[PDB]
Amino acid sequence: ERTYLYRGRILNLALEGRYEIVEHKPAVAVIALREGRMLFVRQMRPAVGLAPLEIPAGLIEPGEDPLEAARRELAEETGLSGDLTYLFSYFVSPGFTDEKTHVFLAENLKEVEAAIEVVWMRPEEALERHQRGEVEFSATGLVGVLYYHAFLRG
Amino acid sequence: ERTYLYRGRILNLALEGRYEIVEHKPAVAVIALREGRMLFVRQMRPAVGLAPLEIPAGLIEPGEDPLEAARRELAEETGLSGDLTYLFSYFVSPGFTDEKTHVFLAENLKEVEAAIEVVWMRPEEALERHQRGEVEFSATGLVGVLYYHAFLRG
Ligand SMILES: [Mn+2]
Ligand SMILES: [Mn+2]
């Protein structure tokens, strides 16, 4: 049985027996390549006290499905639209939260619209900068870099 | 200023202004290949109500550094030891938690020791099973599969 200690905005905290559980909305993330650069974003993240390298991402809102949320976050964070394909999903940290992230690929980007910093960067350079301690990754940023190296080169 | 609503075992819940923040211990995860199979693990995860495909992983304990924790979790979850190399790190979900995961590669595995199910599986098969809806991934499991496809084939 789940017992709730806190019901919030972007999370609930519950106990189930001995387990501490954070309920959290599902999320999306969008991998986009153009001219060899990946579309990263950065924003101040108070939970970690720095701005990691991420890809466009956000929470799925009421009424939306993952594809719709991915379209919305790409537009809202970067002003772009594209042709979206679902790739895969993952639980961010299933030892304590149910947050599930749905990852899409965007192709054929177009500007639809003239907090969030847009950081186009070659994924090889993002990985080198991280290896040298210059930038941190979110899970979504690291997934984008690894997916590119696995499946999008040449 | 952080104000605390809950101080727990594996997390604290705090408010910082409008932000809900979950403090959480840092973690490790270990990528290991043998004979074409990756070392996955599965366990019941009450937060998500299922057993996703993960790689050996766990929290860093007091007094340990990431490399030591990675050695310990590989031994405790699978009974193996290996030569460990640090690869990279990521924040699991920096919009609400500070959990940071340090990922290692293990090579030259040896059995040192005769809850957690050990699932050796080709990463190509793990990705196909996930694409067909048969298994879910944790971030660590997906990172292991993508890292293999990017850097460990042939
Ligand atoms: Mn902006
Ligand atoms: Mn076991």
Side-chain angles (χ1 to χ4, degrees), chain A residues 2-8 10-17 19-109 111-127 129-131 133-154, chain B residues 2-8 10-17 19-109 111-127 129-131 133-154:
Chain A
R2 305 199 163 169
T3 292
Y4 289 92
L5 308 181
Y6 173 85
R7 297 180 140 114
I10 87 147
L11 70 83
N12 306 317
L13 171 62
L15 308 170
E16 191 183 307
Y19 289 89
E20 294 156 324
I21 298 173
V22 179
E23 300 177 352
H24 182 296
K25 290 193 159 50
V28 298
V30 181
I31 300 175
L33 200 73
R34 169 182 170 92
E35 290 183 338
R37 302 178 178 89
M38 175 160 294
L39 179 58
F40 299 101
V41 293
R42 285 191 290 209
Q43 69 185 278
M44 186 52 63
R45 290 295 203 181
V48 300
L50 53 77
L53 206 65
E54 314 190 23
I55 56 178
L59 304 184
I60 301 176
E61 292 303 346
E64 274 180 332
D65 70 22
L67 172 64
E68 291 159 347
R71 173 216 60 79
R72 176 175 50 75
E73 289 294 359
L74 184 65
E76 289 182 334
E77 296 194 336
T78 73
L80 302 176
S81 67
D83 297 317
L84 303 169
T85 300
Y86 175 65
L87 298 177
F88 41 59
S89 64
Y90 64 93
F91 287 107
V92 310
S93 187
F96 83 103
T97 182
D98 60 2
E99 183 182 358
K100 190 180 189 177
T101 304
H102 304 264
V103 188
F104 290 81
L105 182 68
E107 291 174 289
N108 304 310
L109 298 158
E111 216 163 64
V112 287
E113 339 181 340
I116 305 313
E117 179 192 5
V118 169
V119 182
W120 281 109
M121 186 182 293
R122 292 175 59 253
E124 295 90 342
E125 174 57 22
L127 182 51
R129 287 188 189 212
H130 177 68
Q131 297 173 130
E134 188 261 342
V135 73
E136 303 303 320
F137 281 124
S138 67
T140 60
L142 177 64
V143 163
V145 165
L146 295 179
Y147 182 83
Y148 160 87
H149 279 90
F151 299 118
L152 298 182
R153 293 200 281 179
Chain B
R2 305 199 163 169
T3 292
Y4 289 92
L5 308 181
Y6 173 85
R7 297 180 140 114
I10 87 147
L11 70 83
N12 306 317
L13 171 62
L15 308 170
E16 191 183 307
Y19 289 89
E20 294 156 324
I21 298 173
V22 179
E23 300 177 352
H24 182 296
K25 290 193 159 50
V28 298
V30 181
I31 300 175
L33 200 73
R34 169 182 170 92
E35 290 183 338
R37 302 178 178 89
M38 175 160 294
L39 179 58
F40 299 101
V41 293
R42 285 191 290 209
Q43 69 185 278
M44 186 52 63
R45 290 295 203 181
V48 300
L50 53 77
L53 206 65
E54 314 190 23
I55 56 178
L59 304 184
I60 301 176
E61 292 303 346
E64 274 180 332
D65 70 22
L67 172 64
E68 291 159 347
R71 173 216 60 79
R72 176 175 50 75
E73 289 294 359
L74 184 65
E76 289 182 334
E77 296 194 336
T78 73
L80 302 176
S81 67
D83 297 317
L84 303 169
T85 300
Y86 175 65
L87 298 177
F88 41 59
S89 64
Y90 64 93
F91 287 107
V92 310
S93 187
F96 83 103
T97 182
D98 60 2
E99 183 182 358
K100 190 180 189 177
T101 304
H102 304 264
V103 188
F104 290 81
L105 182 68
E107 291 174 289
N108 304 310
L109 298 158
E111 216 163 64
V112 287
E113 339 181 340
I116 305 313
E117 179 192 5
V118 169
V119 182
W120 281 109
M121 186 182 293
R122 292 175 59 253
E124 295 90 342
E125 174 57 22
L127 182 51
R129 287 188 189 212
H130 177 68
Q131 297 173 130
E134 188 261 342
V135 73
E136 303 303 320
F137 281 124
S138 67
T140 60
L142 177 64
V143 163
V145 165
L146 295 179
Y147 182 83
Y148 160 87
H149 279 90
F151 299 118
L152 298 182
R153 293 200 281 179

